[model samples]
Target chain A: GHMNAYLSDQPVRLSPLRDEQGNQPRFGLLLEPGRPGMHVGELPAQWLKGLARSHHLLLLRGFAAFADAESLTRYCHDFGEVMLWPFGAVLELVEQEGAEHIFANNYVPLHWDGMYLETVPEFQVFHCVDAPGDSDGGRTTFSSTPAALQLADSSELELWRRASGRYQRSSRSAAPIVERHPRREFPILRFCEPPFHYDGIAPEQRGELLASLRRCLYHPQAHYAHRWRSDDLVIADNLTLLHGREAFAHRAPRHLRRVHIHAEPALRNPHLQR
Target chain B: GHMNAYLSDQPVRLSPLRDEQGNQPRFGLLLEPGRPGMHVGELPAQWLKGLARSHHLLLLRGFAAFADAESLTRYCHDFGEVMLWPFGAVLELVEQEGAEHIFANNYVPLHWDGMYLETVPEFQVFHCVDAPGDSDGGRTTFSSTPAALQLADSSELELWRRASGRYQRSSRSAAPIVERHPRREFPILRFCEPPFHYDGIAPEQRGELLASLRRCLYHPQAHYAHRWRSDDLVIADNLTLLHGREAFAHRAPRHLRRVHIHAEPALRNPHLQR
Candidate 1:
């Protein structure tokens, strides 16, 4: 009865998914496997918020069918306002597996999505549209700066909080190596894939810092590498986590469809604002 | 050695300060008491950021050397850019504390600090310049919406996330009853002191919702009420916490000095930017 009345008390069994050491609980929450589709739809928005806060990585392991991106996107829209992806609200991350694409199938390092955008979505939801037959080989990996902060020494943490790091892709801008969590008010590492350069430090020291930070984040204890299966859905707080891809055999069959959700006061429309 | 190089690993020993039930862990982190002047300066910015996140209510006790508003103001500046109070950089919360004011010394209900401003500072720092001689009689109470969310029911939480509550102090506007944490990206209740009206519901239902929400938030298990001691400094994350004042005797000899710090991109400079 309370669960029916309270969103926080909604029945979503969450268990911790810790790394090897089990010391840093970075893989915040794991959804209990084997729930039906309506169970997911009934999942309250506030529970999702709680799941995101204490557990940034949420894996909804099994549900009968998230058969297509359209269906998956409909489920995701319930979480919050949908953020338009460049390809649309839902983008199929497939390598020509009945999907259109802009870039070649390439392995990506641990990095955050939307490094090139002016404003990044706060959350990213993904459904495994298809999984490689050799699924374990093409894993998706995620690392959290929040976790990395836990491991950093005072000096390293200081450098991260104060230093400016660059994200260069089709677009470029500088961001703090570490930023205050916008609302939660914690310090979280803001990192991207390699080719990032830190400003204001000696080149040697900068390289050293970058390497050290990356090493700490990429360490097995600080990150999670996921092997996808059909019907799996994952939601992550994009602000605090960095994600990337492992090398899959060239042209291997792996497919994921992603939907991003923007923050509220939802992206101002200049013309409509008058 | 690395701690010396970075701000994140700054020497701030934080231990949990639970509420009465000791179950909810309402008071997240308590900075180990006993430290001296300018110690706040030595407090790494990143650590302050961490302190703000996990422990929305931070206490620095027994640092007697911190004498007045000016000294406390300097220390607060180390944490982040300060937002000026209507009086100045620091406001002396003393009777006739050198400025014209509204409202008498009254007991404040649980509420957030900046409903009136377009941009509210992320952190509020208060130094107890003087405490009520009969200190037990006067306490400053705080409750976090994040904590309330944790204890709420799923249906109640769902209602909170979707509702909009209006704060009609001077200018009026509606804000989500629950907002996404700017950085952490979780649902945090956005609430205010009484007289707030909820949108989309009947007036009676809105009142009922507000009262229920406040009851959940104001519950002893979800809040921490601090009894001030001279030389005690409290720093709170204004973003997610709602704080209030307990009634003090009409002429209680209580005095506090406060400073607010804004998050970076530092509170919009209208004159300089294009």
Candidate 2:
């Protein structure tokens, strides 16, 4: 099979995060035959060690062949913290009381900001997007909203917000893991709140969470949007790739359905069963 | 295993075009060790022969286990023609539009109801409720006007009335199968008309077909309806059970996420693939 590189060496620029360690290495080989399919776990440490040792993150792209989502999710959890954007960073307005009944208790108003993708506890971050859209404003940014997340107050939120680096309103990327690290800085990753919803959380806690989400959902300036076509494969460094969509107005929400491709090949963990 | 009877053995009345012999049997079996799941079509036909002599149709209740849908579907196709009720006869509203689509240079909807199900080549019939708020009149009989379907000529409109049996309105056993004997009837399972997509047919013939289809789509009392739930198991004597759903509002279209089970045991065919 023929391998192709990104169209441009610098298809996208990373925010200026201080990477005292130089360039991060991010590269991947097509393990499966054709378009990738179901896979489990975070990238193998061997693969990540090369990139993680040198820089803070990596990003994989065009990974359309999604495998078992549950497995991918559980595997990531094994390798420190593994977050996911199963539905990507898109917000939808689903009315109907039936639908509303389902969505009303959501911590995030059916929107996937970066927080959901940042599941790994140790690695600290992760995210993926459908292909980018037409305009500069098309990109979603990761920043601090004065309003605490739906339920959290500004003080608690500020603590977490300050915990990591994030992207601003303007950002985009189209590069391999190893290549893009040196060129960009800022938090190559975005981690914020307003997720699709919170399941199994305490009722009161859920209410507060939903409150915190209102800022992102109702914020006049908050914007996240992306358009994704089927079969577009994408992979990302759990620690890099500030992923999110520009929150838009009454406009039709963009759907960037995506699947996460873990770097680990053999997913079955003989010793563990949940 | 314990076997039970419907108590009121009125022997569920079936449609006429089916099994004029009506000597078929219908019974229910309760599997013990009762694995929250019931089992059906698992035993050999000799096992079923007990019911076979007296009943042509056997409707199993709480079979507990699910029938292999893929296997069932293949078996249905192999045994005889199957009648599929798309939106339970709403095919009428789809009217000349859907009818024309199948024939013209447009993409045809390839669904479970495609041309193959019928054993005999007779006109196909289906009925359904429009959107959620669509009205219902003369409960037992289908209403043609105030009309659940869309049409012009309002004056002659009431001229059209919803017919009886249009909305069989009741679905007691699993989604009905009205499995017909193939060679016996030329059941023109109204699939696509000639000139499929106006590509091969002449406009004159197309017009004539569409004109007739208006009646086909709207003839209030043309077909029957059969509503179903999660995992209802229905076993139709290959030549019995002309099944279909009645008119009802739904958040999603009245569609069955289905799987079929074979009546014949596997040992019956060495080359058979389920």
Residue range B26-129, candidate 2, lDDT tens digits: 22122121112213322222333334323433333443332233334433332223344554211222221112223433221211222232222222211122
Q: Which tens-of-lDDT digit does each residue in A1-274 have in candidate 1?
A: 1111111112244556543334444455666522122224324354566677667888766544454566566556656778875576888777543332567555777766656665567788887777746542456778877778788887776666667776555457666777776656788777666636777676767866876798779776578877677767788888778888776554457778888877664533211111
Give the whole-model CA lDDT for all candidates, comma-separated: 0.63, 0.28
The C-alpha TM-scores of every prediction are: 0.54, 0.21
Ten residues in a row with the worst lDDT in model 1 chain B? B1-10
Off by over 4 Å in 1: A1-137, A141-225, A228-274, B1-12, B19-24, B33-38, B95-106, B248-251, B267-274
Question: Chain B alone, model 2: TM-score?
Answer: 0.31
Query: Per-residue lDDT tens digits of candidate 1, residues B37-120?
Result: 445555555555655654567776555437566777776676678897678788778742223246665577876665666666
Q: List the DockQ of the predictions in order.
A: 0.01, 0.00
The deviation in Å at residue B252 for candidate 2 is: 6.1
Candidate 1: global Cα-lDDT?
Answer: 0.63
